[PDB]
């Protein structure tokens, strides 16, 4: 019997974008022989990690480091009296101090010491989640949210040394907001806010700790009880000029305090407030404080929940005495930012927990302390200042922004073939389509006469050292010639009466045009004139099949018998022909040779029978043979510059594309790399780009596939344009890099520019003063009938309000005849929304208000007046909030809190057609989905999925299966009839399947007999009904099929029958914290056997390195060396529940980056194929499976 056992291949296509941690240190010295500068930053999101530099005033990707496979719960850089390397704490409790190093040709992250603490999980006892380092780098401190605090004393030597941990344990005191005070080397002092866990009243009390380097323990110093309203602590550096006595800034909600260590000085300064105070107004708070000091002037920046950015300076109050004062003022503010840094340069990096991280340079620096108007003082602690925010943005100037989606709420999958993902932007509220396809610009296109075929571009020999370049087009009957100059595109002898098989430049200032019947040898004469010095027939008068060429070299193949070899004479311009017969023994199909060099060995010949031969250019010999499928449609030979590999790119008829490694000396055919793209005979062309210079081959089909090879990797890709008939690299004085001249399949010339390429790190491009939209997006919708038309729905933060913005095709739509591209709905807020078509010709929209009211709308497309017109129809009161609804046949299928109502279409309001009462277990329905209108899968907050079946004439959904365990399901879909996808609030990605015992029953029986009537259940099921009525109430159970843990929270699953024409249908998910990843079902077995073995290798690979490094120490690198963190793979990915059949490819991908020594060291554990074939199978997934 065939084992179902779905084998899913997880990939992270785009890596988690919500940046939770940062560090200011200078890690690597790159591109400079000797340089030391403190300006650089490394930022971490849980697993994912990135390293940015500025140094230009504009932020720069340095390298995206390998996936750590853990949850980084804090990261802080340490600077010791040297290269500054960051201390990193995560799950496993391990304190892992890592240095970013340059190894081989890339930057890899090396670990120095990892210290075991607590256990492996995210815990309250776990001394993580609160971490800071002595600003002089003498000691690192970790703490726990509740139980205990540990502080290591860090020392540097020939090898780094971490001192034994210093423990303090307070059982009932829940710790929050660790903030360490800088010191002069006196003694390290850290400050916390301890809230008592077990108490009758809520008591939040600050506590000071001075670690004593002399006595080597942490000492409780001052315990100050403050109001329960307390928020956070910041460290005031010295106050050495005013009057060891550290001073802290305690942010409360509606006011700020600062407190002395000795309690002598407690200063209350009330935080100012906005003028509008829109709708709901909290007492607010300050989320993030930071400190800066220069030229005796130290000011701190503290930002409120509204994003208001404030400063404090200290004044002596010379009149009274020398004593500290506290002075608030107002700045440019910003959006809410989790953490703030400042370079030694005037650049202030704002890391926003909301969406985007952006960097500043401050000039105005803010208002002077002299003004009493807008500045508040500690003179009178009771006072209030109202201020209107300033969008003019005087103080701070945005230099660089980083496009990221931290809160991606929903998305729809648009343009299934190029995997394009349509999702909102949270703050800016712009439409973001992030795409797998290559980003392709289009500029100054021009309409060509109909029925065009191929294209070429050759430098104009007539004008030497000039921008003029000749562009050649082809029609079957006619040939068109065109002249290129900057901004000047003009039209022009040669042969216009016959199709052009080939044309190329020879040597210097010469051209040859090969056409079906005869050749032409053309040379430039004067400016607009050219002259043929010689003309050729084929054998003596046939139809030339094909032609290829090199720089100085040429080949043409006539009908059948012989092939013709040409060269150009050196020191002059001439053509010669050899006397010889290369009979080729068959009819030559197409010819290929390297045109990159003046002399190209190893011609590549194709045969109509479907075989490919090599020709040694002693002289000619056939060293290899390929029998491949259908006849070759087109083929190109290209040797890359970097590695010098000569690759033969062989396109085939019916749309199969192929690629071959070609040995230079032997000419053997090895390393077959195939693909299937579209249905059409493919076309190929060669282009050269950068992103170091680079070369790719464009492939023309139903789609357009750029095949490019990055370093030791290559990825075929679809391009953003729908289709391209013929493509060749182009250059213009108008700035052109990656620039290309091509033609659409419509027979229209166009110029374009490719920009971003889907590398392993990116795999996407994101198509989108300070800009913040008041409307925060809600959901995203798409019409069933229109294949892709995407409707967006947002909300207002304030008085309840909504907007609806519909887009189809390129950009949005107008609303009616109005200028506005969106619609505003007053007093309507959307808890959940879905669009429905009750009739095939009518389209309605569905809103569920927080007022518990169901609102119906009508969508209109104006069509060449084209605009969206929304129309309010009915009003219906609802009992529940309606968290989930969807399209059932002809009807709205909605879920109340308890029960599932199926509404029909009534007039003046919509009607309840049927109601289904849930089993007692289900409290609420988060999300639900249908299978072909027959079946449903209904999710819960607390409990798990339960599948229903619609019974006609019973007018009810009957639950036929329960779920095994309790799982909190955010989003849920169907792969099939019998299986279900689901995610968790906590980050589990699982897939369940109904048991075959149930599938036989439902396949062999009608649903009407389930609720009442005769259905014969095996003896065990009934005994489970009377024995365990609570679990088996639904009389079946989901056997766990696939389970996985992705640390994000999955927002949207989508099951795509094909990803960029790939055969294996994938399921792609976007997470909330932002991510998109896929689960690819693996066909056959040895796919998942080889993948499983590679994952098993990379799993303990760090341990294998540790045991080798151990044995060599027995005959004469820590344990977490290769993983950089203590977490095992199976442990991290297992976590909540063990992964079942899912093998994680995100691990096996890390095998690609390791050096050849390490890789060959790992693969020796297998009797199976060599490292090269390993990398083959690894890279096979992105190419072939999507």
């Amino acid at each position: 019997a065939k084992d179902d056992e779905l084998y899913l291949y997880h990939l992270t296509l785009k890596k988690q974008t919500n940046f939770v941690h940062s560090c200011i240190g200078h890690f690597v010295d790159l591109e400079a022989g000797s340089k030391r500068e403190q300006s650089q930053l490394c930022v971490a999101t849980e697993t994912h990690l990135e390293l940015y530099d500025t140094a230009d005033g504009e932020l720069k990707l340095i390298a995206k480091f390998q996936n750590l496979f853990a949850t980084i719960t804090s990261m802080k850089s340490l600077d010791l009296p040297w290269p500054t390397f960051l201390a990193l704490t995560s799950d496993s409790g391990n304190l892992s101090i890592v240095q970013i190093i340059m190894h081989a040709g890339a930057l890899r992250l090396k670990t120095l010491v990892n210290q075991p603490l607590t256990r492996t999980t995210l815990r309250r006892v776990s001394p993580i989640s609160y971490m800071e380092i002595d600003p002089n780098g003498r000691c690192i401190i970790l703490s726990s949210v509740e139980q205990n605090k540990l502080c290591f004393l860090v020392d540097y030597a020939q090898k780094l040394r971490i001192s034994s941990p210093l423990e303090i344990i307070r059982p009932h005191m829940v710790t929050l907001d660790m903030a360490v005070v800088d010191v002069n080397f006196n003694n390290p002092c850290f400050v916390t806010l301890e809230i008592d866990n077990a108490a009758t009243q809520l008591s939040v009390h600050l506590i000071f700790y001075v670690l004593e380097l002399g006595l080597n323990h942490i000492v409780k110093k001052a315990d100050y009880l403050v109001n329960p309203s307390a928020n956070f602590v910041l460290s005031l550096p010295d106050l050495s000029r005013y009057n060891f006595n550290p001073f802290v800034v305690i942010g409360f909600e509606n006011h700020i305090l600062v407190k002395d260590m000795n309690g002598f000085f407690s200063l209350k300064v009330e935080i100012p407030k906005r003028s509008i105070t829109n709708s709901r107004h909290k007492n607010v708070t300050i989320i993030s404080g930071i400190v800066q000091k220069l030229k005796n002037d130290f000011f701190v920046l503290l930002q409120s929940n509204h994003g208001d950015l404030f400063k404090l300076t200290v004044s002596p109050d010379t009149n009274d005495r020398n004593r500290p004062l506290v002075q608030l003022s107002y700045f440019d503010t910003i959006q809410n930012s989790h953490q703030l840094h400042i370079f030694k340069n005037g650049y202030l990096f704002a890391l926003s927990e909301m969406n985007n991280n952006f960097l500043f340079q401050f000039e105005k620096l803010g208002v002077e302390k002299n003004d009493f108007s807008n500045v508040l003082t500690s003179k009178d602690p009771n006072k209030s200042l109202v201020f209107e925010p300033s969008i003019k943005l005087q103080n701070l100037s945005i230099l660089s922004q980083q496009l990221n989606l931290n809160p991606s709420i929903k998305s729809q999958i648009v343009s299934d073939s190029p995997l394009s993902i349509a999702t909102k932007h949270f703050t800016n509220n712009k439409i973001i389509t992030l795409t797998n396809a290559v980003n392709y610009s289009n500029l100054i296109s021009t309409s060509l006469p109909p029925n065009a075929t191929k294209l070429w571009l050759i430098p104009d020999p007539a004008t030497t050292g000039d921008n003029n370049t000749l562009l050649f087009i082809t029609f079957p009957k006619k040939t068109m010639i065109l002249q290129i100059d900057n901004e000047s595109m003009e039209e022009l002898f040669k042969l216009s009466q016959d199709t052009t098989i080939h044309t190329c430049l020879m040597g210097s200032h010469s051209i040859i045009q090969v056409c079906t019947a005869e050749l032409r040898h053309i040379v430039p004469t004067g400016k607009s004139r050219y002259s043929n010095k010689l003309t050729w027939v084929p054998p003596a008068g046939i139809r030339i099949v094909c032609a290829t060429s090199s720089k100085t070299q040429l080949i043409i193949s006539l009908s059948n018998y012989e092939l013709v070899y040409f060269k150009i004479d050196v020191s002059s311009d001439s053509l010669i022909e050899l006397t010889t017969h290369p009979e080729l023994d068959t009819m030559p199909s197409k010819v290929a040779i390297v045109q990159d060099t003046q002399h190209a060995d190893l011609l590549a010949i194709a045969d109509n029978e479907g075989m490919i031969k090599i020709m040694s250019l002693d002289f000619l010999t056939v060293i290899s043979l390929q029998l491949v499928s259908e006849k070759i449609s087109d083929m190109i030979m290209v040797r890359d510059s970097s590695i010098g590999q000569l690759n033969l790119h062989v396109g085939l008829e019916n749309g199969v594309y192929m690629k071959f490694h070609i040995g230079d000396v032997d000419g053997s055919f090895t390393d077959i790399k195939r693909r299937f793209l579209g249905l059409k005979p493919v076309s190929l062309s060669y282009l050269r780009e950068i992103s170091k210079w680079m070369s790719c081959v464009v492939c023309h089909s139903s789609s357009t596939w750029v095949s490019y090879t990055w370093k030791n990797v290559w990825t075929i890709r679809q391009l953003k344009d729908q289709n391209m008939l013929s493509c060749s690299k182009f250059v213009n004085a108008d700035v052109a890099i990656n620039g290309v001249c091509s033609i659409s399949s419509s027979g229209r010339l166009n110029i374009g520019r490719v920009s971003n390429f889907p590398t392993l790190d990116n795999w996407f491009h994101v198509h989108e003063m300070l800009q913040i939209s008041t409307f925060r997006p809600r959901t995203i919708l798409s019409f069933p009938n229109n294949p892709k038309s995407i409707l967006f729905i947002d909300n207002h933060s304030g008085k309840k309000q909504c907007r609806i913005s519909l887009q189809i095709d390129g950009e949005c739509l107008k609303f009616g005849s109005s200028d506005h591209l969106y619609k505003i709905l007053d007093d309507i807020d959307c808890v959940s929304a879905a669009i429905i078509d009750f009739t095939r010709q009518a389209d309605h929209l569905i809103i569920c208000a927080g007022d518990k009211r169901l609102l119906t709308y009508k969508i209109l497309v104006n069509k060449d007046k084209l605009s969206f017109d929304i129309e309010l129809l009915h009003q219906t009161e609802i009992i529940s909030p309606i968290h989930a609804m969807l399209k059932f046949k002809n009807f709205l299928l909605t879920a109340m809190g308890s029960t599932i109502v199926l509404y029909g279409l009534g007039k003046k309001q919509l009607l309840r057609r049927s109601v289904t009462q849930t089993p007692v277990s289900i409290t609420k329905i988060v999300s639900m989905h249908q299978w072909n209108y027959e079946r449903l899968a209904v999710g819960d907050i607390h409990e798990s999925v339960t599948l229903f079946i619609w019974d006609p004439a019973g007018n009810v959904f009957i639950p036929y299966v329960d779920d095994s365990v309790k799982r909190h399901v955010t989003v849920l879909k169907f792969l099939d009839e019998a299986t279900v996808i689901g995610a968790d609030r906590y980050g589990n990605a699982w897939t369940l399947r109904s048991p075959p015992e149930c599938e036989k029953i439902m396949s062999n029986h009608d649903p009407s007999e389930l609720s009442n009537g005769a259905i014969k259940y095996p003896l065990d099921v009934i005994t489970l009904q009377q024995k365990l009525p609570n679990t088996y109430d639904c009389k079946f159970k989901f056997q766990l099929l696939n389970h996985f843990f992705v640390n994000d929270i999955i927002t949207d699953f989508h099951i795509l029958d094909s990803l960029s024409n790939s055969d294996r249908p994938g399921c792609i998910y976007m997470g909330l914290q932002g991510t998109v990843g896929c689960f690819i079902p693996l066909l056959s077995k040895g796919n998942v056997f080889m993948m499983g073995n590679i994952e098993n290798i990379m799993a303990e690979a760090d341990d294998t390195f540790y045991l080798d490094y151990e044995s060599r120490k027995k005959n004469n690198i820590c344990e977490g060396s290769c993983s950089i963190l203590g977490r095992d793979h199976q442990e991290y990915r297992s976590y909540y529940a063990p992964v079942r059949k899912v093998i994680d490819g995100d691990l096996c991908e890390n095998f690609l980056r390791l050096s050849l020594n390490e890789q060959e060291f790992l693969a020796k554990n297998l009797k199976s194929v060599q490292v090269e074939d390993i990398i083959q199978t690894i890279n096979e997934v992105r190419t072939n499976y999507m």
């Binding site: 029909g904 009534g906 007039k907 003046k908 309001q909 919509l910 009607l911 309840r912 057609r913 049927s914 109601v915």
Partner: peptide
């Protein structure tokens, strides 16, 4: 130990299934 069958005056969106069947027998 609430279904709505939509009468023709468009006020029957509150009207029960069995009630509208009774008005089928009456109609």
């Amino acid at each position: 130990q609430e279904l709505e069958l939509e009468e023709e005056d468009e006020e029957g969106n509150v009207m029960s299934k069995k009630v509208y069947d009774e008005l089928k027998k009456q109609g």
